[PDB]
Every structure is written in C-alpha cells, then in structure tokens.
Design a protein around this ligand. Structure first.
Ligand SMILES: NC(=O)c1ccc[n+]([C@@H]2O[C@H](COP(=O)([O-])OP(=O)(O)OC[C@H]3O[C@@H](n4cnc5c(N)ncnc54)[C@H](O)[C@@H]3O)[C@@H](O)[C@H]2O)c1
Ligand SMILES: NC(=O)c1ccc[n+]([C@@H]2O[C@H](COP(=O)([O-])OP(=O)(O)OC[C@H]3O[C@@H](n4cnc5c(N)ncnc54)[C@H](O)[C@@H]3O)[C@@H](O)[C@H]2O)c1
Ligand SMILES: NC(=O)c1ccc[n+]([C@@H]2O[C@H](COP(=O)([O-])OP(=O)(O)OC[C@H]3O[C@@H](n4cnc5c(N)ncnc54)[C@H](O)[C@@H]3O)[C@@H](O)[C@H]2O)c1
Ligand SMILES: NC(=O)c1ccc[n+]([C@@H]2O[C@H](COP(=O)([O-])OP(=O)(O)OC[C@H]3O[C@@H](n4cnc5c(N)ncnc54)[C@H](O)[C@@H]3O)[C@@H](O)[C@H]2O)c1
Ligand SMILES: Nc1ncnc2c1ncn2[C@@H]1O[C@H](CSCC[C@H](N)C(=O)O)[C@@H](O)[C@H]1O
Lengths: 233, 255, 255, 255, 255
C-alpha cells in the first residue's frame, strides 16, 4: 500500500495526458460482465446441462478438519464448473439442512448460497435419477472408466479422508447397487509414489475436460505431477 | 372508461388472462373466460362475480370457440374486446450433439397449434361477432389484443418452438390490423417479458430468481396487474393499432 | 393516478407537449412547460392554472435547461416525470440530380442539435435532478419519456435529417435505460405517426389529408389527446422500460 | 469458395431454390433438390448434371425428409449447407364483413405446416447430419439458410397466414442459431421482397408491372440469381449468424 | 468482380476501412483512403500500391471532404463505391448517482459530429459525385455502405452517445436510399459486432478472451476480412438496398 501510494504520486508527476484519446468502446466493468455471463450460462446448464452429483453423505466419516477441507474443495470445484464453456448441472445430494456440512457451506458462501445455480436437496441421487443412468465414481471399483458418457449421471463422493478408509464410497454405492467406475491411472500414468484418490476440484476438472471432447492425456494433466512421473507412451 | 364493455379473454382462468379479467371486471366490464374445461375457470368466474362467466373451450378447435362466442353473445349480447392470453411453453433444444437428442416434431406442432393457430382461430372467429357491432363515434367496432413474448425477438436456448409461435403472432399482427381496419377493429400485441405466473413453474426456482435479478428496472418478475393495466390502456387508446409493445422492464435475453 | 407528480415537458407550449401538459394538469399533476421564450408558452402556462409554470429555455443549451430545472425545483420542489417533446422538422432531399441541389450540412446539423442533442441534454440534466428523489415503494425515482417518430423506421423522401435524429433517439433509448436502471429511472420512447399539431397543419392541406386517409384505422390524423393518454399510461405502468411504442394507427409510410 | 460443398435445397425444383441450386452446382458444389414428387424436380436435377440429385420429399413429413437426407448422405457422404426455399402462398382476408366470409382454419394450418413446420422439420433433421461432420478450420460444420419474407415485417391485406409463417421463421432464426452454436452450425434467414418466380407471374400481368414499379431501386422484380448470390455470400462469410437480411431493393409493402 | 471500380473509403487507414481497401484493391479496384492527416494513411496507401491513394480529410468538414473527392475524381476519373467507416467510440454513463457525475455534452456532440454528421456529409458529397456517372446496364450509378454498430440495437451501459449516433445512421439509411433511388444509388448499412480492430485489440488480453467467449459462434472477435467480404457482397448484389445487415456472429450485448 505504501509502495503504491508513493509510486502513484510518481506516476502523477508525468501528467502526459492524451491517454487513448478517450476513444473507448466499453467502460471497465469486466468483472461484473463476467459474473453475469457465468450466471446466464449457469441458468442454461440448470435447464439443459448434464447432471453431476456430489453426495454429502459422509459427515459421519469425517473429522472437523476433514469437513473444512471438503467444504474448501467443494467451493473450488463449483468455481471451476461455473467458468466452463459447458458447465455441469451440479446437484448437492444427501445434504442435510441442519448438518455440519450444510452449516459450513452456508457460513462460507453467505448470501450467495441462495443464488448458486445448482440443485441442493436432502434426497439421494437414487431418488432423482434412474438407477441405470447413475455411475458412482470410486477409486476402489473393479471397473475402469474408458470413455466419458454424456447420458450418464456421474456421482462424486464429497469425501476427504486423510485418515484412509478404503471402500467406503464403494460400500455406499453397493447398498444402492449402482454401477461404479474408477479413473484410469495405472493405464495412462506411471504412478510413482502417492495416493490414488484425488480431490474434488481435480475430479471435476478432469470430468469437465472429458465432457468437452478432451482426451485422456489432457484430462489427466490435472493429476498432481508430484504423484506420477509421466504419461505412459 | 371501460364500463359496459364485454371482453372475451382466452386463457382467462390463470395468470395474465385472469389478471386482465379481474381488472376489467373490477373496472365495471363484463368478462367471458374462454378456457379449457379442466382449468378451474368456473371457480374463477364464480369468485369474480356475476359480470364474469366461464366458457369451456379449446382455442385449437373451431367448434369450441364458436360455442364460447355463442355463450358470450347470449349472456351479454355483444363482444367488444378479445384478449388472446392462451398459450403454452416448451423447453426443448433443436438438436443436442452430445446427447444425440433431436427436437420432437410433435412438441413443435403442439406449441404452434396452441400459441399461434389458436390465436388466429380466436381472432378470425371473434372478428365476425365484433363486425355485427354498431360502429362507435370513431367507427371502432372492437379491439383485439394478442399476447406474444420477447422470445419473438430474442429467444434463448431451448425456445425454438415458442419463439416460432410468438414470432408468428408478431408477424401476423400487422396484416390482420390492415385486414380489419375497414370494419373498425384494432389489433394490438403485447410482448411481455418475465411475469410471475404458473407458466414459470416449470423452471427451477433459482433460474427464475436469476432472471428476475437480470431485469434492469424494476429488478423483479412482472406483476400480472401490470399486464392488465397495459391491456386496459390499449383498450382506451383509439390510435394504438398494428403495433407490438414490449412489457419487459428493459430485459434482453441472452443465450 | 398522477396527482402530486411534477412533470417537466419540453416543447410544452404547443402540439403534443401542450396536450400532455393539459392532460396531466387536469389529473392533478404539476407541469413545467420548458419552451423557447418567444413561443407563447406564457399564455398556455397562465391558462392551465396554478400548477403549470413556464420555463423559457432552449433544449440545446445547458445553461437554459439548468435554469429551467432550478425553477422547477424552486416552485414544485422536485421532478418526477420528464417528457421530451421539443423538436423541429425539415424537408430536404439528400441530393436532387435534376436540380443539382445538395442537402446543406447546416440543416442536418440544426435538426440533429434540436431533436437529438437537446433530448440528451434534457435527459442527462433531468436524470441528475431526479436522482435526488427518495425512491417510492417500487424503488422508482422518476420516468423519462422521449418523443421519436415512425421516420426512425419508415423514413420518407426528404426526411434524412429528421429520420437520423429520431433513429438516434430510438438507439439511445435502451442504453440510457440500462444506465439509469440502478438509479430507479425508467426511460421510454413514443414514436407517433401523424398528429394534428402545428407541425403538420403548416403543410398543404391536400397532402396532409391524403396522409390522413392512408392511416388504416382510424383514418385520420392522430389526436394529441391520444398521445397524452399514452404518456400517462407509460407513467402509470411501472414495468414499461427501454421500449419504443408506435402510436401511429398502423400506418407504414411510403416513399 | 463452394467447391466440394454439399447443399440440400428444399423446394429446389423451381424459383429461388432452383436458382440457388443452379448457382451452387455451376461453381463445383453438389446439390440435393429436396422437392415434391410431382414438382418436376427430376428434370431439373438431370439438366443440372451429376453433381445434382433429386429427392422426392415432403418437408412436412419426417419420413420423407429423413429419406432425402439418407439419399444425400449415400450419394455425397456429407451435408454442408441447407437452404429452406420450400413454401406456398395463400391470399385470404381474415374477415370480410361486406361478404360475410371468414378465413378457413385449414388454409392457415396448411400455410403454417408447409412454411413454418416444414422449415423446422428440415432444420432439426439436417442438424443431425451436419453434426456428424468433422468441424473444419474455425469449428464450423454447416450453414442453414432460411427463406422468410418481408411480409414477416410489413404484411399486406389478405396475407395473415403467410405473414404468420414467415414471422415464425424470423422469430425462431435466433433461438436456433443459439441452439446450434456449440455444434458449429450457422443459422441465417433471407427475407426476399418481390421476385420474378412462378409464384408472382400467377398474378395478372398488369399487376406485375405495378409491383415492379413499386420497388424503389432497381424498379423491377428481383432476379432469383440475386437470391442465389446472397445465399452464396452467406455461405462464404463465416461471421454471419442469427440474422435476417432483407433482399427487397428498399421496398416497403403498403396495405 | 470489382475490377475498375473506384472506392472512397473513409477511415481507410485502419481497422475495417483498411481491410475493405485491402480486399477491394486486391481484386483490382481503385481505392481512396479518406482519413485524418496524422492517421498514418499515407504509409498504408503506399503499401497498397498505385491503385490506392490517400486523401487527408476530416469527414466532419465539408471543405475537407470536397477536396478529398476532387482528388479522387482527378486521380481515377470518377467514384463508384463509398464506404463510410470513419468513426470514434466513447464510453460514458448518462449519470452516476454515487459519484454525482453527469455525461458531458461535448462528448455526445463530438461523437455525433464524427459518426452521424460525418457519415451524412460524406454521403451527400459522394452522392453528388456519383450522380455524374452514366448509369450501367442495370441503371446503377453507385453504392454507399455505412458502418453502424449493434449498439444501435442493444447498446450497453456507457454507450449512450455511440448508440445515438449509430441508431441515427440506421434510421437515416432507408430515407437516403429512397432519396437516391431515382438517381440509381444504392444505400446500405453494415452493423458489425465485435471485430479484431485497433479499437478492440488494444484492450487487455483477458478482456479480449471474454469478448471472444461472448460471441455464440464463431467464439472469436470478427476478422476485418469478413467485413470486407460482406462489403464486396453488398457491392456485387444489385438488389440489396435500404437494409441493415448485422455482421456480429449472433451476439446480443449484455447491459
Ligand atoms: N408467463 C410469462 O412470463 C410470459 C411471458 C411472455 C408471454 N407469455 C404468454 O402469456 C400467456 C399467458 O400465460 P401465463 O403466463 O398466464 O401462464 P398460464 O399457464 O397461467 O396461462 C395460460 C392459460 O391458457 C390456458 N390454455 C392453455 N391452452 C389452452 C387451450 N388450448 N385452449 C384454451 N385455453 C388454453 C390455460 O388453461 C391457462 O389459463 C401465454 O400465452 C404465454 O405464452 C407469458
Ligand atoms: N407532429 C407529428 O405528427 C409528429 C410526428 C412524429 C414526431 N413528432 C415530434 O413530436 C414533437 C412535438 O412536435 P409537435 O407536433 O407538437 O409540433 P410543435 O412545433 O407544436 O412542437 C415543437 C415544440 O418544441 C418547441 N421547441 C423547438 N425547439 C426548441 C428548443 N430549442 N428549445 C425549446 N423548445 C423548443 C417549440 O417551441 C414547440 O413548442 C416534435 O419533436 C416532433 O418532431 C411529431
Ligand atoms: N416469389 C417471391 O417473390 C417470394 C418472395 C418472398 C418469399 N418467397 C418465398 O421464397 C420461397 C421460394 O418460392 P418460389 O418463389 O421459388 O416459388 P416456387 O413455387 O417456384 O417455389 C416453391 C417450391 O416449394 C416446393 N414445395 C412446396 N411444398 C413442398 C413440400 N411440402 N415439400 C417439398 N417441396 C415443396 C415447390 O414444389 C416449389 O419447388 C418460398 O418459400 C416463398 O414463399 C418468395
Ligand atoms: N471495432 C469494432 O469492433 C467496431 C464494431 C462496430 C462498429 N465499429 C465501427 O466501425 C468503424 C471502423 O472503425 P474501426 O473499428 O476500424 O476503428 P479504427 O479507429 O481502427 O477505424 C476508424 C478510422 O476512422 C478514421 N477517422 C476517425 N475520425 C476521422 C475523421 N474525423 N475524419 C476522417 N477519418 C477519421 C481513423 O483515423 C481510423 O482510420 C468505426 O466507425 C467503428 O465505430 C467498430
Ligand atoms: N481415482 C479415482 N477414481 C474415481 N473416483 C475418484 C478417484 N479419486 C477420487 N475419486 C472421487 O473423489 C472422491 C473424493 S476421494 C475420497 C475417497 C474415499 N476413499 C472414498 O471412499 O471415496 C471419491 O469419493 C471419488 O468420488
């Protein structure tokens, strides 16, 4: 602030004037226009977009710190979705109204919460979509995802377990008898050292890249580089 | 004033038509709510009073509209105003490459039949009764006010059929005004923007909230009382003819 | 109801402006006829009553409009509505090959200065004046109505300057509405057709009668009372904004 | 250029569609005249050459349009351009108090089916084949040009159904352009005025001269070759989208 | 082809005018870049070759445009096409309540003078020049093509003066076409959207990316070559007259 003040006086010393001749076509209101365009795109997606579900049914498997991490990653994922040329229609399923996760989301979003262009509901993903169209993404599924399908509803578990609990999302998907898929990471990446469960933001970015006709290399460029060593040739 | 006028309001059991009927009957006019038999029109007519009656009709049918007009003439003796506010909306994209989904010709045909064909059916049939009216001091025999949408000029994604029907109404407004000028009937069109009516129930609540926030001023959804006020203003202005009026609060629709 | 409103009507000493002032003062509003000093506006202001005042001003002069608005604020305390009806007409072909005659840049400049530049001058100064109002229930601080012409759409031979100015008004109507929406001011434009005002009775009666006969319905020149009625309707309806309404009787002008 | 392009021209055996097909095929493109079985399009396709094939189809039928598109794909393997020039004209006053004659709902429905429903049928079905195209430099997979009329804007007496259909085309031009923007298909509309096609010569020859004189400049009926030239210009320009171009020679239709 | 044609391109040293000059001279025509003395138009004229000359002139000055046209007539012998591309943009809100800032009258006046008054000055003088040309086989003495903006239809916040000038051009297009029809001069207007010209490429890269994303399809700023292509298409088509063509890629500007 002090540097900007002194430099601002220095820039005042010039007084060169003749700045662009005042030949401007638009006022500098670009952040507002970007927000409005994102809102229009979000409305269009809510009407015709492909559904993508985050199921907030893990509050009992997460400590307070993991809950804060999950909320932060949910914000980053939603933000990445909004900017996209073809956003998903995001559903927040199994989100208890008075639960800890909903409370933290409301606290973090403030009045924007009621204006987020997404569907938040207490009902499960099985009460909203046909069981045949639902694919539940897990890292422990026997099946391996090959192609992104535009008529399928992908379900991501809004779960952050820095205390490893393998099979929890798979177990939940098995109770409902839902098809499960896992991202191809052994096929395309030499995994090196790391954990095979990515964050929500990375997952949504991969899925958005795939939905926009991106290949697996481009889609998996979002996997943290520190984990793997390269894209298998 | 509008005291003693007889208005045939299509789709008058709900939304804009119901608001127009309420305003006109409160001002002292007579109303015939021309609506579908299962639309709850009779209850609205009862609630409005003895100056309003309900005509169960489908604007897509010539016989039903003829029966409704016969009922209107029997009850009140003449038809002076005709407000075409009957219509439906469809949210379907022309083609979706990712989903391989194609717009169904049936949906397009249905929207055209109700919004566009039904409006012209009502107009042509009611012009016959308004032609039997003794011309006014200015030679006016009656007024017809159609309802269009701003989709006729700026339609957003998944609005091809609705936009086609409303654009057809807009395009045919002037020819019909010229056709009926010799017999002193004025034909006008209102192109409302976003109003709070059961039509918007289909959209998610958040979409409606965003769209309302996107109205420059007043930054809200339209109140049907405003549509009724504009309808009465058109009824009371003898020189408004052949024109489309955008009642939209200055909103312009984006893709 | 417009009782209690304060209307600044430019060109209010004659024609459409005088008709608007008469209609509004009759309802109960207060009017400020903003007109040229040597225009007879003093007599009209005296005739209308104690709620009408005369402001001798030129819409193309910033100082004159500032003085007129200062007088309005000193007299009535505030400004609620601003009706721009000041304007001039010129008949001059762009180029006549047989006569070798060219449109003079002076005539084009004068018509632009009066019709277009003066309208914006009044709009900006009265927008500054109306921003001091406390918003009403609906958050509205004032209404600005501007007069355009169907020449903006259907321009005739020897009407290039008039058409340019009216098209400029039509083009600026929506940007200004978007500009003033956050303040709570509505901007509307009326594009009348042919009206029985001194701007037309000056022309030969034969061509004027021919034009009046060519109005589909009513087959007559518009009555300035109809223009005033439409102005009041725009003032009353809170959802009309950023739109042009053709009060022309369904007439489309021929070359 | 248009070398190697494949164009599906509905109503391509006569008039504007035939002129478009002639211009395109004469410049190295391939044409599929999608026309009625008894329209004499087989002779036109034979005369044009091998790059032209004839598909007997009814644009109002899904099965016929699908068969025509399948034939086009089989013969050429692609559909790059679509030109909706199929249409019919009906002249009938909405009401006639002097005669007591009323517009028949059948005429209105037939006009809407052939002009508005058939156009959307072709558009929605050909977006499927143009969606299989691999996007080229710029991401474009095809172009869709529609034939509206100036009657969509200034319709004459006894032209309400035609005006309704053309206004529907004009209204749905933009929503469809917004629908197919992700796919990469441009949707354009041409609103021709008065053209020297078999549609007009049906009128009395005396009226042909009057209509030719009614055009400001050139004072003649439009040549279909000029419609074909505008079609090719729209094809070549990769930035025209969601727009209506009036190819009418400055004419404005009077009542 | 346009070989042998002589084109007077105002604002021809940069942007759309420069692209038009490049295309037309490349096809074999002769061009006169009518531009300001300190716009670096002499370098462009020399770069374009012998068939291009530079006329230092202010479109707002009658004497300067007269001298430019005299130079054009002496150098090439006549004038066939005129392209009005000279213009300036200004962004300024009509009134800012928070800052208490009012739109300056000088900005509005100078935008009007450069765009609307300058276009009319060039139009009238070059129409006088064209009137001397022997009509061709089609009876045409020349073509005039003006550059409007989509701001003439959906101008945004801060575009009041720019929208006023461009709407004036749009409104005066048809009257001038009717005026010059007896002389056989076609008058057309192109309303471009967002083009990659120095008026836009000077913005920060993020703004340019946002603007490109705002275009439905193609999602990029318009190429000036596309504007030149549309200009040539208008020149070659003898039946385009008194029409405004939106070359904007189906975009509709947000508030
Ligand atoms: N809702 C908006 O904001 C909006 C905006 C622009 C235009 N419009 C148009 O306004 C009109 C009023 O709709 P609304 O907003 O009141 O919704 P609405 O559903 O309340 O009005 C439609 C009415 O039409 C009646 N109706 C439907 N089909 C009919 C048929 N075949 N025969 C007879 N009656 C029939 C319905 O029973 C209902 O009363 C519609 O034509 C709509 O397209 C509405
Ligand atoms: N008369 C029509 O049928 C018609 C049609 C379309 C549009 N218009 C427009 O309607 C408006 C009203 O005109 P009218 O028909 O009442 O004719 P009018 O001549 O009676 O109205 C013009 C008024 O503007 C005033 N005026 C002119 N220049 C002024 C200036 N610089 N400063 C202040 N006041 C000034 C005049 O004194 C006069 O009172 C005009 O703007 C006209 O262009 C008229
Ligand atoms: N002729 C004009 O001056 C003019 C002016 C404005 C608009 N238009 C429109 O331009 C288009 C061109 O028509 P035109 O002037 O060449 O007249 P036209 O009769 O020569 O062309 C119409 C064509 O449509 C075909 N057609 C009609 N119904 C069909 C169907 N169901 N399936 C397939 N083909 C069908 C006809 O066989 C014919 O080939 C029409 O849509 C017309 O309404 C024409
Ligand atoms: N750039 C856009 O995206 C865009 C969009 C819509 C409309 N337009 C309009 O298109 C036209 C083309 O301009 P551009 O976009 O190439 O910008 P530009 O500044 O590159 O071109 C304008 C040209 O006009 C010349 N000029 C300016 N004032 C002049 C005067 N008084 N006399 C003579 N020459 C003068 C300038 O020297 C320059 O050569 C302008 O009128 C512009 O407003 C531009
Ligand atoms: N490799 C992978 N394949 C598929 N889904 C994955 C994935 N890595 C992360 N995800 C998704 O990202 C979510 C957060 S990771 C938490 C994983 C935890 N073991 C569980 O039971 O799910 C996962 O629930 C899953 O929906």
């Amino acid at each position: 602030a002090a540097a900007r003040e002194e430099a601002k006086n220095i820039k005042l010393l010039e007084t060169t004037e003749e700045d662009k001749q005042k030949n401007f076509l638009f006022l500098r209101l670009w952040d507002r226009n970007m927000d409005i365009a994102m809102g229009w795109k979000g409305a269009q997606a809510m009407q015709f977009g492909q559904p993508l579900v985050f199921d907030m049914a893990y509050e009992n498997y997460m400590k307070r710190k993991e809950l804060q991490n999950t909320v932060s990653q949910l914000l980053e994922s939603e933000g990445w979705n909004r900017r996209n040329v073809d956003p998903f229609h995001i559903y927040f399923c199994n989100l208890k109204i008075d639960g800890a996760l909903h409370r933290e989301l409301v606290k973090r979003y403030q009045e924007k919460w009621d204006k987020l262009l997404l569907t938040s509901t207490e009902k499960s993903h099985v009460d909203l979509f046909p069981k045949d169209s639902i694919i539940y993404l897990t890292a422990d599924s026997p099946n391996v995802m090959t192609t992104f399908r535009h008529d399928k509803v992908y379900v991501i578990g809004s779960f952050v377990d820095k205390s490893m609990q393998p099979g929890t999302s798979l177990a939940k998907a098995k109770r409902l008898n839902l098809a499960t898929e896992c991202l191809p990471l052994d096929k395309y990446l030499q995994w090196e050292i790391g954990n095979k469960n990515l964050t929500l933001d990375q997952m949504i970015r991969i899925l958005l890249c795939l939905k926009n006709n991106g290949n697996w290399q481009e889609a998996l460029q979002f996997v943290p580089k520190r984990k793997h060593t390269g894209f298998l040739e | 004033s509008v005291k003693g006028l007889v208005a045939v309001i299509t789709g008058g059991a709900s939304g804009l038509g119901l608001a127009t009927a309420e305003r006109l009957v409160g001002q002292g006019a007579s109303a015939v709510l021309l609506d579908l038999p299962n639309s709850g029109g009779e209850a609205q007519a009862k609630k409005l009073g003895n100056n309003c009656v309900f005509a169960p009709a489908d604007v897509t049918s010539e016989k039903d509209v003829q029966t409704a007009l016969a009922l209107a003439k029997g009850k009140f003796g003449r038809v002076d105003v005709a407000v075409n506010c009957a219509g439906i909306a469809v949210a379907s994209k022309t083609y979706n490459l990712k989903k391989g989904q194609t717009h169904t010709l049936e949906d397009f045909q249905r929207v055209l039949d109700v919004n566009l064909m039904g409006t012209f059916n009502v107009i042509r049939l009611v012009a016959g009764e308004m032609g039997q009216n003794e011309p006014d001091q200015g030679g006016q025999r009656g007024v017809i006010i159609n309802t269009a949408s701003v989709a006729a000029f700026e339609g957003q994604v998944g609005q091809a059929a609705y936009s086609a029907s409303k654009g057809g109404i807009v395009g045919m407004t002037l020819p019909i005004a010229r056709d009926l000028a010799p017999i002193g009937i004025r034909v006008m069109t209102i192109a409302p923007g976003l109003f709070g009516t059961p039509l918007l129930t289909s959209l998610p609540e958040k979409v409606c909230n965003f769209l309302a926030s996107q109205v420059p001023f007043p930054s809200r959804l339209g109140d049907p009382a405003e549509y009724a006020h504009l309808v009465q203003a058109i009824i009371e202005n003898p020189f408004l003819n052949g024109e489309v009026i955008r009642l939209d609060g200055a909103i312009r629709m984006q893709p």
